[PDB]
């Protein structure tokens, strides 16, 4: 993985995507991108 560096800065997981983030700002953006998702449909 890209973020496979020895750093404890990456501790943000999106529960739906399983995505690991290292920064808060892009994380919240990704969590705001849930509005672009489809619950089921
Ligand atoms: Zn996500």
UniProtKB/Swiss-Prot annotation:
UniProt subcellular location: Nucleus
Zinc finger (C2H2-type) residue numbers: 12-34
Subunit structure: Interacts (via zinc-fingers) with JARID2. Interacts with NSD1.
Comment block on domains: The C2H2-type zinc finger 1, also named C2HR, mediates the interaction with NSD1.
Family: Belongs to the krueppel C2H2-type zinc-finger protein family.
Function, as annotated: DNA-binding transcription factor that can both act as an activator and a repressor.
Protein name as it appears in the record: Zinc finger protein 496
Protein's gene: Znf496
Residues of the full protein shown: 397 to 434 of 585
